[PDB]
Amino acid sequence: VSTQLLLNGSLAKEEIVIRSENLTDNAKTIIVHLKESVEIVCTRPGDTRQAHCNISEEKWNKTLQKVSKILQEHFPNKAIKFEPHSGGDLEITTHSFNCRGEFFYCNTTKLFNGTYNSTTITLPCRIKGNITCKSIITGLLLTRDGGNDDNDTETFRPGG
Amino acid sequence: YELTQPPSVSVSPGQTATITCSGASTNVCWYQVKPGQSPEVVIFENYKRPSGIPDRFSGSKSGSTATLTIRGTQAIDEADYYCQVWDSFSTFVFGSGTQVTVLRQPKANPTVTLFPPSSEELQANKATLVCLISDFYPGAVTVAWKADSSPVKAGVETTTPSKQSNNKYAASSYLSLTPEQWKSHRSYSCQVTHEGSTVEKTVAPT
Amino acid sequence: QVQLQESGPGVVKSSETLSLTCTVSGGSMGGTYWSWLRLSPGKGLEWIGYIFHTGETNYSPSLKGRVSISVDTSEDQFSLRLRSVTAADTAVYFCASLPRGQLVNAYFRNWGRGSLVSVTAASTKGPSVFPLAPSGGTAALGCLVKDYFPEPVTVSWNSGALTSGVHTFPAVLQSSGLYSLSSVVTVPSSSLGTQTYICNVNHKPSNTKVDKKVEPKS
Numbered sequence: 023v024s025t026q027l028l029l030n031g032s033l034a035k036e037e038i039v040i041r042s043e044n045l046t047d048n049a050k051t052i053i054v055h056l057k058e059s060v061e062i063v064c065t066r067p068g069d070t071r072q073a074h075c076n077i078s079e080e081k082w083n084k085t086l087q088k089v090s091k092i093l094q095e096h097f098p099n100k101a102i103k104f105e106p107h108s109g110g111d112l113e114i115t116t117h118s119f120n121c122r123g124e125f126f127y128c129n130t131t132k133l134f135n136g137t138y139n140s141t142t143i144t145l146p147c148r149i150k151g152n153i154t155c156k157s158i159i160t161g162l163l164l165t166r167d168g169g170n171d172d173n174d175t176e177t178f179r180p181g182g
Numbered sequence: 183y184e185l186t187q188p189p190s191v192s193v194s195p196g197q198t199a200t201i202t203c204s205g206a207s208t209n210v211c212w213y214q215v216k217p218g219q220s221p222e223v224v225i226f227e228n229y230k231r232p233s234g235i236p237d238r239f240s241g242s243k244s245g246s247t248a249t250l251t252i253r254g255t256q257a258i259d260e261a262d263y264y265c266q267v268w269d270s271f272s273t274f275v276f277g278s279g280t281q282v283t284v285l286r287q288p289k290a291n292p293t294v295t296l297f298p299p300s301s302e303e304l305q306a307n308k309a310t311l312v313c314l315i316s317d318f319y320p321g322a323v324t325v326a327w328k329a330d331s332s333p334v335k336a337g338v339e340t341t342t343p344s345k346q347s348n349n350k351y352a353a354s355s356y357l358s359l360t361p362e363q364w365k366s367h368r369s370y371s372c373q374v375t376h377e378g379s380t381v382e383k384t385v386a387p388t
Numbered sequence: 389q390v391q392l393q394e395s396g397p398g399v400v401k402s403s404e405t406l407s408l409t410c411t412v413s414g415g416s417m418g419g420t421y422w423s424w425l426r427l428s429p430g431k432g433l434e435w436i437g438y439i440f441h442t443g444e445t446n447y448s449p450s451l452k453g454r455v456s457i458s459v460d461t462s463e464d465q466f467s468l469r470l471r472s473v474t475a476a477d478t479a480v481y482f483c484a485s486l487p488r489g490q491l492v493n494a495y496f497r498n499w500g501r502g503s504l505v506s507v508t509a510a511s512t513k514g515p516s517v518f519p520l521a522p523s524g525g526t527a528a529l530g531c532l533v534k535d536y537f538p539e540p541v542t543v544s545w546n547s548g549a550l551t552s553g554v555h556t557f558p559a560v561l562q563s564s565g566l567y568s569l570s571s572v573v574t575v576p577s578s579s580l581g582t583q584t585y586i587c588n589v590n591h592k593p594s595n596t597k598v599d600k601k602v603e604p605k606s
């Protein structure tokens with residue numbers, strides 16, 4: 023499947039588990055399971071196709087710092103940076119989902135803007151009344167970029 | 183906007199040939215291009231080597247500059263190489279291309295000859311400077327023009343090296359000006375860089 | 389087992405429109421970015437743009453505006469149009485593939501045949517021939533065959549009598565599509581002002597046969 027976030031899924035009871043077929047390799051999709059969910063509400067007021075997605079900054083801004091800490095346990099003495107999707111089509115680059123009879127496409131660039139070291143984020147979307155989906159993020163789909171760049175700043179991207 | 187490669191690289195048959203690629207913030211891949219045929223990837227993701235590619239082809243990268251190393255260089259390696267990188271604005275950016283050449287003949291310094299616009303042409307209200315580079319090997323040069331003492335890039339046309347009967351190469355570069363531009367400076371100059379030496383000719387209006 | 393090849397003309401006159409089509413045989417158009425790229429000296433290898441099977445297109449910034457890529461899912465072909473072309477467009481065009489996904493590491497697969505489209509000048513024109521007067525004691529003089537079309541041109545010195553030292557260079561392709569070249573002789577410096585030197589230029593396509601005497605400076 024070609025998404026980025028997991029809506030209405032399962033939660034890792036204990037803590038945060040990293041699961042992949044080959045962590046030493048970069049081509050294989052990384053699927054990190056979380057414990058505490060994060061609220062993501064995408065409303066569609068009404069351009070008319072332009073929507074948004076309110077997501078508390080702090081919650082998200084923390085559920086990447088701890089996420090780095092676990093990644094650092096799989097990559098010794100290496101920084102962990104998060105950067106947006108590098109895709110060529112709307113379906114894969116943006117957070118797409120079927121919300122009450124409509125497919126969305128959220129420019130989720132603001133979610134992955136810089137390194138994380140230990141208000142409300144609004145994401146523009148694509149496609150008359152007021153629609154509202156109330157899902158919760160249980161996990162993340164990531165994809166590491168290999169190559170042994172010597173800055174040792176492991177860049178991660180949401181994809182598959 | 184391009185990633186920066188050197189125009190040429192030359193080594194004796196069966197030696198280490200290194201090609202740089204400066205200006206890439208993300209991972210880099212490479213393409214070998216031979217005349218007529220289509221480009222083909224030899225290295226991807228900085229140092230990954232796909233099947234069909236000999237294990238003498240390698241490479242690495244350090245933050246900014248990516249590298250393509252070639253040991254035991256033979257005749258079947260002679261080709262133009264182009265590095266590529268992804269981008270968040272232009273999507274894809276390639277390097278300026280490097281020309282690998284195996285020395286099968288002693289090196290020769292290029293003979294440069296610069297001609298000023300002829301009285302005849304100026305009558306026609308046109309002005310052309312003619313830089314003629316002949317008898318040099320290997321076949322790869324860099325032509326740089328200067329007006330007075332500052333560089334000039336607009337109005338310059340330069341051929342690609344053409345092998346002559348003498349086994350060596352020859353090129354030419356023309357700086358087209360208007361008689362006004364030509365006479366408003368006191369000296370135009372043509373500098374040709376080849377290997378580790380540069381010849382510079384300078385003419386002036388009278 | 390996927391093959392790509394580019395049909396379409398190999399000649400598109402100046403200020404017109406270049407139209408190419410890349411046929412895909414042996415494989416569906418789904419789950420792939422069908423791209424175009426071109427290659428030439430003075431501009432090197434540069435990406436033009438690609439297209440998804442839904443028609444979603446992403447063109448290169450540099451050529452953004454006069455570029456357009458379409459795709460007919462039926463005939464398993466995708467096209468390419470490049471408007472208001474010029475001499476700078478003369479290059480070898482390609483059609484290649486890109487696996488749908490992260491482009492950060494992606495590299496083009498299934499390269500095309502290598503189609504070479506040449507944007508020719510507007511019509512036939514004869515050359516204007518100009519002399520290049522001369523100043524380890526030798527000296528160099530030459531001729532300047534300027535603004536002509538099409539190829540080729542033959543230059544000779546002193547009715548073929550003079551050969552040793554002569555060197556005629558490959559023509560330059562002007563931005564305007566026209567051609568120009570130079571012939572030069574390295575003659576003994578003491579031969580100046582005595583031994584007459586003449587360049588015989590002939591451009592048959594325009595029945596131009598100029599013989600210009602190249603004599604020392606005034």
Ligand SMILES: *[C@@H]1O[C@H](CO)[C@@H](O)[C@H](O)[C@H]1NC(C)=O
Pocket residue numbers: 044046047
């Ligand atoms: C995983 O990738 C590594 C290289 O990073 C390789 O050595 C190993 O064999 C791979 N594991 C499997 C199960 O193929």
Ligand SMILES: *[C@@H]1O[C@H](CO)[C@@H](O)[C@H](O)[C@H]1NC(C)=O
Pocket residue numbers: 115116129131
């Ligand atoms: C995300 O938002 C930025 C805002 O500048 C926009 O330029 C970019 O194209 C968007 N990405 C996509 C592919 O939606």
Ligand SMILES: *[C@@H]1O[C@H](CO)[C@@H](O)[C@H](O)[C@H]1NC(C)=O
Pocket residue numbers: 131132134135136
């Ligand atoms: C990048 O981060 C800055 C804050 O450091 C923020 O203002 C900006 O909007 C971010 N850029 C993106 C990709 O949205």
Ligand SMILES: *[C@@H]1O[C@H](CO)[C@@H](O)[C@H](O)[C@H]1NC(C)=O
Pocket residue numbers: 079080083135136137138139
């Ligand atoms: C959250 O952490 C990120 C780390 O990059 C920082 O850039 C950002 O400014 C922080 N913002 C808030 C509101 O915590």
Ligand SMILES: *[C@@H]1O[C@H](CO)[C@@H](O)[C@H](O)[C@H]1NC(C)=O
Pocket residue numbers: 029030119120121122155156157158
């Ligand atoms: C997820 O579940 C919520 C209820 O908690 C529901 O309203 C929403 O439609 C679901 N999300 C999607 C996009 O199906």
Ligand code: NA
Pocket residue numbers: 218219480501502503504
């Ligand atoms: Na070709």
Ligand code: NA
Pocket residue numbers: 184276277278279431432433434
């Ligand atoms: Na280039």
